[PDB]
Amino acid sequence: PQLHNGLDFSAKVIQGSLDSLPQEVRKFVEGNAQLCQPEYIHICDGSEEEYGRLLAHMQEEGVIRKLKKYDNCWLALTDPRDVARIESKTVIITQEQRDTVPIPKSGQSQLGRWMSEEDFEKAFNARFPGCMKGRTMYVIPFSMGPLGSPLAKIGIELTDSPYVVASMRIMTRMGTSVLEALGDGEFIKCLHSVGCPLPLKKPLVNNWACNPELTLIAHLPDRREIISFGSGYGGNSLLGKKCFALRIASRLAKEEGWLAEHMLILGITNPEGKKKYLAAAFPSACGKTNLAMMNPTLPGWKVECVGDDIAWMKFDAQGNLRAINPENGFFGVAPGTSVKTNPNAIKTIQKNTIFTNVAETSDGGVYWEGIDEPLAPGVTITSWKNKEWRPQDEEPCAHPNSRFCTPASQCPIIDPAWESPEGVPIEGIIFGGRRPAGVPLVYEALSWQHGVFVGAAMRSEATAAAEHKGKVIMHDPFAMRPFFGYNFGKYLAHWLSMAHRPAAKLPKIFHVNWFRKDKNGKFLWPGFGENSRVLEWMFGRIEGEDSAKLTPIGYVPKEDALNLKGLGDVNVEELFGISKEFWEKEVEEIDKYLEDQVNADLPYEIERELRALKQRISQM
Ligand SMILES: Nc1nc2c(ncn2[C@@H]2O[C@H](COP(=O)(O)OP(=O)(O)O)[C@@H](O)[C@H]2O)c(=O)[nH]1
Ligand SMILES: [Mn+2]
Numbered sequence: 001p002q003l004h005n006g007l008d009f010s011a012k013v014i015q016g017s018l019d020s021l022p023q024e025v026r027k028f029v030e031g032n033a034q035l036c037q038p039e040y041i042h043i044c045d046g047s048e049e050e051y052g053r054l055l056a057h058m059q060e061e062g063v064i065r066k067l068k069k070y071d072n073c074w075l076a077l078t079d080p081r082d083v084a085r086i087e088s089k090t091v092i093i094t095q096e097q098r099d100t101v102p103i104p105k106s107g108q109s110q111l112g113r114w115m116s117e118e119d120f121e122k123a124f125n126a127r128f129p130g131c132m133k134g135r136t137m138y139v140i141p142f143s144m145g146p147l148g149s150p151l152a153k154i155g156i157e158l159t160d161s162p163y164v165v166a167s168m169r170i171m172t173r174m175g176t177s178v179l180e181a182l183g184d185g186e187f188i189k190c191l192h193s194v195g196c197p198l199p200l201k202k203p204l205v206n207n208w209a210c211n212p213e214l215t216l217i218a219h220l221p222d223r224r225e226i227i228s229f230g231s232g233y234g235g236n237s238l239l240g241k242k243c244f245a246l247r248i249a250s251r252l253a254k255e256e257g258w259l260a261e262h263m264l265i266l267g268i269t270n271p272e273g274k275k276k277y278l279a280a281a282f283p284s285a286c287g288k289t290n291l292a293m294m295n296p297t298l299p300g301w302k303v304e305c306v307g308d309d310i311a312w313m314k315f316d317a318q319g320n321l322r323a324i325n326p327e328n329g330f331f332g333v334a335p336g337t338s339v340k341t342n343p344n345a346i347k348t349i350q351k352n353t354i355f356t357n358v359a360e361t362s363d364g365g366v367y368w369e370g371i372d373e374p375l376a377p378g379v380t381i382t383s384w385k386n387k388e389w390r391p392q393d394e395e396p397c398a399h400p401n402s403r404f405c406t407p408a409s410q411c412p413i414i415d416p417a418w419e420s421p422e423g424v425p426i427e428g429i430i431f432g433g434r435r436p437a438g439v440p441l442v443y444e445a446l447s448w449q450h451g452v453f454v455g456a457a458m459r460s461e462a463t464a465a466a467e468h469k470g471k472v473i474m475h476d477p478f479a480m481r482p483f484f485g486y487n488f489g490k491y492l493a494h495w496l497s498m499a500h501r502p503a504a505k506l507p508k509i510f511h512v513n514w515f516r517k518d519k520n521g522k523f524l525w526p527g528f529g530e531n532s533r534v535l536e537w538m539f540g541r542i543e544g545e546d547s548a549k550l551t552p553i554g555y556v557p558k559e560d561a562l563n564l565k566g567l568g569d570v571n572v573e574e575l576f577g578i579s580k581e582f583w584e585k586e587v588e589e590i591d592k593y594l595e596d597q598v599n600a601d602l603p604y605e606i607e608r609e610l611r612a613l614k615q616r617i618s619q620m
């Protein structure tokens, strides 16, 4: 009911019906409509027509270009200030700070950024009021994971960005069928605005609406709400990805007894007809996608891709660890993707694919550094800065974090069960990062507890995923440092608890290092398709083959255990060297880190593994 005409936004609905919305769905829409004051409200139905008019609108607004060389592929150049995931402006709001991050013994926590409700209410009220003035509010109903799937959760994103709606149509399951499945069930409330209400008081660079100064990505797990403002780029705007699928989901999984992890999922089959499913957690820009879509070099081996970034896992009745990719597409980095590195990626992005900040060729194609592909005579390149670009300038034509957004179904090696609502049984878990020195190519954990300790001890050099720069090695336990939904100590404890479940078929735990270097700065391992040689060893260890040698850090392959045929020139000495001098410093850094950051919430079993490892190393 109302006394005037200031609460019923029906007259602003250009597609859909507020009447057809579930009870709580309508309230969430009209409430923020009244707060944000959008000129129009557009309730997405996921249709091809919608996608069609949507793209055409963005092309008439100078938002995106059409890549005439490919089938239904589009380019989008963003503002140079809004070109990646802002880790420093992401915050989690909990009544108690301890719920979010362990109280550091001395210094600032690196495992999350907490903000009180009082501080957030101020920041919120200073951003969203009237932020969509003169823009359309798109209502994105999307399901994470297959519909009806048990570990499938539904969210509603409100956004004033057509670029976001198009991307979300690729990355999630979006449309009207999601509304009907939801019914009156619960859902995740997602609110996004670029923060440039009209009239534009700030000119737009590359026609990219954004507000860097006021950027803020907030999470409220107690309320099941995600509030993002000022950014339109991937992690910040695609709220169902990082914000939902990891941070909020991790909190839920802790509550509900499953797991939400920053892991690729791949299935692998050997020449004997036996197939196994593995999961790998690497930091961003550390090889997950190239591994999940690997083109193996060992004959009789087949790799299939279930997912490349997010895994939702839970033990089933039979005690197996089951995993699903809750996403619907791939949002991978562009540069370095060549036919020689990730050819399966090339085959996927040639249609229905949206690119961001990659270079455009004068004939209607894409270009980026490392594409490893000569262009024809008379073909010019326009950089992502929208300027004539030549290979003689220092300006790279493709931004380091530039992306492609492609449907998962188009992948030629997509696993025939990536949408199976029952998941895939994970028999192995892989950790790793970019360690230039010290860490051997691969080793196996001595037990679950040691495994959990290995994940927690992961470290890697600074890449181009967040705002980190320089050549520095920092901690990234479980590859989840930027995405922990709650206290990390309680995270570790949650993992260790899996060893207590009845008839729990705990998978093996490996640590790989694709990036060990020599004294000249030369990679000691070709990697990519050759990583199938490392997976071969893992496959045999899962079946119980006496191919492992015991060492102070874990099991490593025996002599002549790794199929190295076709190489011969690989320096195996330095590739597996376990220097005591290096590992005595490694334990010190891990100790100091764990004592400071996890402090009084560090489980004792992790402290015991730390103690045990320090002991085995001193006996060298
Ligand atoms: N040396 C080496 N580099 C790799 C390998 N796989 C990927 N890369 C590089 O890492 C960058 C990002 O890899 P990607 O698979 O997209 O990482 P993701 O973010 O985890 O999906 C690419 O530019 C590649 O050049 C590998 O096996 N060996
Ligand atoms: Mn990721």
Ligand SMILES: [Mn+2]
Pocket (backbone or CB within 6 Å): 288, 289, 308, 309, 331, 332, 333
């Ligand atoms: Mn990726």
Ligand SMILES: [Mn+2]
Pocket (backbone or CB within 6 Å): 496, 499, 605
């Ligand atoms: Mn225990």
